[PDB]
Amino acid sequence: DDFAKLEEQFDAKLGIFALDTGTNRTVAYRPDERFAFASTIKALTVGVLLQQKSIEDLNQRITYTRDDLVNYNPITEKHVDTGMTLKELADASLRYSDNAAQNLILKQIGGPESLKKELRKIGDEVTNPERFSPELNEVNPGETQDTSTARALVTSLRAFALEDKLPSEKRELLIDWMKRNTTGDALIRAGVPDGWEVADKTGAASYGTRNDIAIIWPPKGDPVVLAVLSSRDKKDAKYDDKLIAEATKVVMKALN
Amino acid sequence: DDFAKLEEQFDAKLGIFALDTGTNRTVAYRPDERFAFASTIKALTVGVLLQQKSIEDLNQRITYTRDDLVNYNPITEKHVDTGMTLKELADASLRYSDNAAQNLILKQIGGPESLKKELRKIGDEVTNPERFSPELNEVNPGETQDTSTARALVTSLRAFALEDKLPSEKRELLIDWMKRNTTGDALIRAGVPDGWEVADKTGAASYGTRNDIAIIWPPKGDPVVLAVLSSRDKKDAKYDDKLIAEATKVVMKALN
């Protein structure tokens, strides 16, 4: 087993779930093991925002202050005086992993407890949003707050991006933001051939937690939805993007 | 001086022009010397395409065949049976330097002659588009077909991306494509500190020609536009990306 080999080579725990959406074939390795979801949750948060707003409603401008800025605000730190629309915030969140942009959106939908509620509504009994960003990245082993599983993240991302939890024009906006992610070049994208389109959202959290969730479109045929989640056993561990890239390679061979 | 030194270390000729758009301070070294432009011309070509089409017009699907494929077709080779839209062709050309994509775009705007006319229209009397890809990369010393200069490529890139040859929505498309280029990690990008956003387009051609053009954004300040061009004196010469990285570091210091 090639996933066991990766765990060995990288001294890490892997959580993998992959669904070929045209055949229902699956590739699983610890699919039901919890990990901190880290910023992957930003994608589910935008799915809920899109549920709750018309495309036009995304033009609402949000005002905020330096008080709303947190640890990492690459876009949001530029627009304190002009504000940013909900559409611009969704962009920043998904494409740059802008943590204040996530916090701003979470406030607009009613906060972590509200997000949790809406995830339950679409059938996700696993994913447990509790905190704002970046506090949700502090998860100790055994704890269930702000965790999910590779199977649940896959099932939820499919639900919003590809199934009927959103109407098509809204699915298209989510897919477009995720296709044009800036943060994921060394992860799932690195284990897929050039010319296979990828929409992804990365995450990093404590205990060397390193995650990528994605939709992958082969040149023909239906897409694959994948979660590659990882963690290590020391609290301040470093992660290695190559683990996710190599894991992706394994999945693609097993499905193809 | 430091550019001399790099020419001595890498046995090569360097063309450098850099403009700090905030101060109008400039850094130049052989700035009006001609070089084969190579695939840097891809950025300009998308500039022309964007100008001539609405954003919605980019969704027009182009059907192509194996005969449209040339020596390097990382994206276009995958979708012969489905075709690709003009937008997807622009993504392929800019982010992967897909040669067929550039040719297909060039056909849609009226060919090299018509691209020449449009560049003269934007104020570019230097750049001399004459051929398709890959043949445009074959330039012998002293010839002016398919050549430009560092000053002219900076002037033109700025006009499209930052000034008024395009409306902002189209500027955003071109800039985001160039920010997410996959081919330039070892060139200008490698001479700029991590975290500063960089938009770039690379090229390589005969006589060990190796080019990169870019916009570089300090975390705050107006952007710098930069062209680093290079050639060597044997026809079959190899180039070294490290020449381009090191030249860039020089420009950054010269501007600070």
What CATH number has the domain bearing residue B227? 3.40.710.10
Kind plus residue range of the DSSP H or E element containing A183: none
CB burial of residue A131 (10 Å; 0-12, 13-18, 19+): middle
Best B180, B183, B196, B200 member to test A by mutation, with max A CBs in 10 Å, is B180
Pairing of strands B35-36, B26-29: unpaired
Cβ neighbours of residue A130 under 8 Å, at least 6 residues apart? A112, A113, A116, A136, A145, A146
Tell whether omega for the bond before B74 is within 30 degrees of 0, i.e. cis. Answer: no
The answer to whether A121 contacts chain B (CB < 8 Å) is: no
Task: Kindly report the nearest CA distance between residue A84 and chain B, in angstroms.
Answer: 16
Cβ neighbours of residue A107 under 8 Å, at least 6 residues apart? none
The answer to whether B180 contacts chain A (CB < 8 Å) is: yes
What's the distance, Cα to Cα, between the start and end of chain B in Å?
17
Nearest Cα residue to A214 out of A231, A201, A195, A203: A201
Task: Kindly report the nearest CA distance between residue B79 and chain A, in angstroms.
Answer: 6
Kind plus residue range of the DSSP H or E element containing A192: none
DSSP A223: P
Gap between the Cα atoms of A248 and B139, Å rounded = 41
Gap between the Cα atoms of B102 and B133, Å rounded = 7
C-beta atoms of A180 and B179 within 8 A: no
Distance of CA A66 to the CA centre of its chain: 26
CB B147 within 8 A of CB B34: yes
Task: Kindly report the nearest CA distance between residue A250 and chain B, in angstroms.
Answer: 21
In the block, which residue shows the tokens 């070509």? B45
Gap between the Cα atoms of A250 and A165, Å rounded = 30
Cβ neighbours of residue A39 under 8 Å, at least 6 residues apart? A97, A99, A102, A133, A137, A201, A202, A203, A204, A211
Resolution (A): 1.9
Give the count of domains, chain B.
1
B203 annotated binding-site participant: yes
B184 three-class SS: coil
Query: Which residues does chain A have within 8 Å of residue B69's beta carbon, measured at their own beta carbons?
Result: none
CB A46 within 8 A of CB A97: no
Residues of A with a catalytic annotation lie at 39, 135
Residues of B with a catalytic annotation lie at 39, 135
C-beta atoms of B77 and A220 within 8 A: no
The answer to whether A71 contacts chain B (CB < 8 Å) is: no
> How many Cβ atoms sit within 10 Å of the Cβ of residue A210?
26
Length of chain A: 256
Structural domain containing residue A160: 1-256
Torsion (CA) A122, A125, A131, A132 in degrees, nearest 10 = -30
CB B214 within 8 A of CB B196: no
C-beta atoms of A182 and B182 within 8 A: no
Gap between the Cα atoms of A138 and A209, Å rounded = 10
CB B161 within 8 A of CB B199: yes
Kind plus residue range of the DSSP H or E element containing B204: strand B197-205
Partners of A217 in the β-ladder:
A197
Gap between the Cα atoms of B160 and A161, Å rounded = 34
Tell whether omega for the bond before B112 is within 30 degrees of 0, i.e. cis. Answer: no
Nearest Cα residue to A86 out of A55, A124, A118: A55
For residue A92, give both structure tokens. 């920043």
